[PDB]
Symmetry: C3
Subunit: 328 residues, 3 copies
């Protein structure tokens, strides 16, 4: 019932993936699928024409910012842009609360990226218009999780059924400790019948916090067992019997010590060889950009869908904006 | 007669607040009010759709640039942005006159902000398209004046009457020397029955030429008396019988002694008139304590919101077909 | 004719002026002229409405970036801008191939300015959408050549005829060595019946390989003679009997004052001669020359709007 769902979603801020419930998630997946058909047939996509947004990006994140701008403008809307290298360079003396109180009288909605946990939450309480969090310091990047799930669901639509006999097995590989994308998508997937392989070097293990949350979310639907969560330090064991391989970025800005960065960047390299004993239906995701995590040769392997995944982002962002901001 | 005033304003540049006459001021106010009703009722505000603008900002002024962009885009028009720390990084060898001659062949109009006084005036005489000055070295910021006036007029509509028995009293408080906002609004208010309190430290006093322009403008409508301009030292005396309090920003560039001289608190407001309204061009740092935001005398966030309506109105009047 | 040409040009990347052949040049010039009429008569110009572009400028080049944005927006389209000082801050660890692969799934076309040739060539192979090169290190600046040629063609339309009895004579003046704009436009003009006067100081001479290409092109269309290419030291000889004077930017001290165009120096030129300069100018043309009817360098800049509109339209409609 897209109409009941849309009334509920209208004017919603999306800050954490838990702001999206089951019915909203189905509305987003369905709407995303419509926009995919629309774009792929070169149909008119201007379903949100009279809106003006502000996109405020207070750290270097030009790829994410451009993804949101492309979705706004493809919807037929307009966007003005605030971009700065950090938040203090923009706010200067001014409080986040004043800035958002006024900005929100200028525009119909705001896309906000700020590594400060606190700033996004201040923004939301002071804004008189809906905010979409495009990523913040505290591990929430909801539109990424949504586009990841959309992508997963396209190959394995049983993920939505909550069928005790149809379990999806995913391996997360790389920086589990700091990977926000992993945190947020884990939280979402664990609402469904999903089992997890965590593959990482010791100092980049998945945090306890995330494991507790995954545990809680699986138990809630009686899908939690001792086989639900496995831990591995090598690909040959961790890649066995998974439907999805999700490779994280290894972010240089996160590892000061360049030797640590060099150790972690080359610990898990996906090649055609490391893929030989995976399931025939397995699909490889990566939020992008990559550096050495996935060899170029893998781009020709039909198991890889990480470029399709990034393209799916346009559809899913358009869908989310449309559902929140349309007057109908 | 809006139709007759719209023919007059079409393709007008707005550089100084003296480019706007009494009747044009009325049409801006009236048109701003229409945009306010439209926007408050969540309605379709595409009143100017087929235009392309260039916004040229040659000092850091992110907020003002976003204000204008919002107005343009909300009207249904388009904008391209040139942004730089200073004007020399942008012009480099090239004359302002060449740059504006060419730019004007690409767009329908130009919003220009440049800390140089002279540049804007060069730009206007070289441009084949209207220019809106969004603030310059010579203390002219006419759209700020317009929106300030609109906000004042909302609470004290008699300011338009030039009735000898209904005088508006305003205190400007802070940096009067370098306050672009103060110079421009004083020039506009002084065409009406208004008296002025200037509250500042010695180093930041209002320039004489602003005093001359005020005096000259008041004399011209017989509103000048020896009471018309007073100068104070402290708030308690400065704020005494004033319908409007206008706090300036006190910005670091132009300091530790200046920044704490005049902070508006609920204390400093106890012996103002019941009906006084507080304006501030924004952003605010410490000039007004947060407690004053709940005091119903404060209207600075409405004032900034009003700027959407007034900028939309101005653009509409100048650029529509 | 034009729908056939448009089907051909649809989805073309324009990287070098040699990506544009005779018939594509004709469609560009025709369509440019239609946009000129439309704009000058205040008519609706929204011929490309549902398109979203990405403008990627990886060196400072504000004026060229604004021209393309103006043309996109005048067509009724939208643009998102990527706008930093070098390419390494933008690519960081990502390959140019991955970056363009993904960006071309988000947008309908890309306007790209990068001083690196390697980058532009990888972009074109990786992009699933057409790219327009907005200028690069190597002097390929095709939209500048196109608008230069449009401007020339307006005053001397015989340039397109390839008539042995109607030759256009052009002088290029200033920094011929480093003046990209010259190299590119020379290559385009040498497809036609054109003779060249190169006016420069010793150290800023036109490169021999540009002279080789010009020679080759003139021979191929049977327009080459021993008068085809002349070399000069000075304006008084150089400016003689030329339909076009093209002044370069001089972008030093001694080498930037040698050829300044004044009303005096124009006294013995043809009455019909037109003065172009790709702009901005510093000292190369005196302000007095702006009033002289022979000067068209501001009309030339304005024409650039029409020409960029035309090219965008023809590629992306
Ligand atoms: O994930 C990516 C998104 C992009 C968007 C715009 C331009 C380049 C991009 C590269 C990416 O890896
Ligand atoms: O104080 C202000 C903050 C702003 C933030 C974004 C856009 C416009 C703004 C105007 C303000 O006065
Ligand atoms: O010389 C030029 C100046 C410009 C200024 C603004 C936009 C485009 C411009 C192009 C020029 O050649
Ligand atoms: Na824009």
């Amino acid at each position: 019932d897209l109409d009941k769902i849309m009334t509920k979603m209208k004017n919603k801020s999306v800050i954490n993936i838990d702001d999206v419930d089951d019915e909203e998630l189905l509305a987003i997946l369905y709407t995303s699928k419509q926009f995919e058909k629309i774009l792929k047939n070169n149909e008119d996509s201007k379903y949100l024409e009279n809106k003006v947004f502000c996109s405020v990006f207070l750290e270097p994140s030009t790829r994410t910012r451009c993804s949101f701008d492309a979705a706004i403008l493809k919807l037929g809307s307009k966007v003005l842009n605030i971009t700065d290298m950090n938040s203090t360079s923009f706010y200067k003396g001014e409080t986040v609360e004043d800035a958002f109180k006024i900005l929100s009288t200028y525009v119909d909605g705001i896309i906000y990226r700020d590594p400060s946990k606190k700033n996004v939450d201040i923004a939301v309480s002071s804004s008189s218009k809906p905010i979409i969090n495009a990523g913040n310091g505290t591990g929430e990047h909801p539109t990424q999780s949504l586009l990841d799930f959309y992508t997963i669901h396209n190959y394995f639509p049983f993920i939505l059924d909550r069928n005790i006999n149809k379990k999806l097995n995913i391996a997360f590989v790389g920086d589990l400790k700091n990977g926000r994308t992993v945190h947020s998508l884990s939280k979402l997937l664990s609402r469904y019948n999903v089992s997890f392989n965590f593959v990482s070097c010791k100092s980049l293990n998945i945090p306890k916090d995330i494991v507790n949350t995954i545990t809680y979310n699986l138990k809630k639907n009686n899908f939690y067992s001792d086989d639900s969560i496995k831990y591995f330090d090598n690909l040959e064991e961790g890649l066995e019997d998974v439907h999805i391989i999700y490779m994280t970025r290894i972010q240089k800005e996160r590892f000061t010590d360049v030797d640590e960065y060099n150790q972690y960047k080359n610990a898990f390299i996906l090649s055609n060889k490391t893929l030989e004993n995976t399931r025939d239906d397995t699909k490889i995701l990566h939020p992008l950009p990559r550096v050495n995590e996935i060899k170029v040769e893998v781009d020709s392997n039909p198991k890889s869908v990480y470029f399709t995944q990034a393209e799916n982002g346009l559809y899913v962002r358009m869908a989310l904006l449309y559902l929140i901001f349309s007057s109908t």
